[PDB]
Ligand binder design. Sequence first.
Ligand SMILES: N[C@@H]1[C@@H](O)[C@@H](O)[C@@H](CO)O[C@@H]1O
Length: 320
Amino acid sequence: KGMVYYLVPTLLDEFQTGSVNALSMFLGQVGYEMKTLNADNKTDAQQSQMNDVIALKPAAIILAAVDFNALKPSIEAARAAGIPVVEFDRQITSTPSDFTSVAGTVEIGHIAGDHAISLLKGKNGDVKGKILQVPGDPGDPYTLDIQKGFEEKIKAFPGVKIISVPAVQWEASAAGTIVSDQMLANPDIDLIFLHAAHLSVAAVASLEAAGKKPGDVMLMSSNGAPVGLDLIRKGWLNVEVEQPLYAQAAAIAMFMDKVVGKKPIKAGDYDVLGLKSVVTMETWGPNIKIPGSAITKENVDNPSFWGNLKPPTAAIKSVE
Ligand SMILES: N[C@@H]1[C@@H](O)[C@@H](O)[C@@H](CO)O[C@@H]1O
């Protein structure tokens, strides 16, 4: 049917390596081969790779941009040369793509927010306290939009103080250092919210080295990686708001025939791996937005949560 290239930004967590495996398999089910190129968090490498792939004229490119600004010209070059470009996970609103498959990021933030509020209230009686937020890389719209959705909720209660410190390049060691430094300066911190679970792995270790045990400082993160689900069962993590990795990948495969053949993608409500998903036509082109979900000890074992690594059995079917 055609070759698809995936320009993955890094392979430095379970969502990234997982996305490779999920895209390859689902694209295999609808008849496409896939090849993966890793930018390892270097914009230069990814732009070199775009051009390399442009020159290889595949049936489509799937991009998850290291930096959402820097790649805008690249995306345009591909489309100039009539190569379909699909944006995965990291939304690029500034220039048209042929398809976009993302989580509801602002909504994940909102969900994070609601729980931060119910937590704190649970601890402090009133909606008050202090939160440390550890967003991801500033070049990444996934964490940028989660930040908006989260702050929107918290700001509504000025009795909650927020301290936010980004983990540059999505690095857990940066998270680690932030948590130790912010904790020493603020022993009153009630909750840390980090925008992906591999960051919470560092937070836990930092909290441990300060003498803390599970539950002492509440913790939440927002991508659903396996390590997060581990930390939930261990009592370290109060909440993990997942993004639906498998659905986001499957959605790309479901629509690949429309994307490769340059056929239109119809707006509406779709089911993707059992998730109600919403396709709209945006200025950056067709866009499917798949909901995230709050996970706690109470539902951490649900097989629909990608962190349990139970991908749906059967197969994807191409949208007609
Ligand atoms: N949505 C993903 C998130 O799960 C995480 O893999 C991050 C890489 O650390 O990149 C993107 O933000």
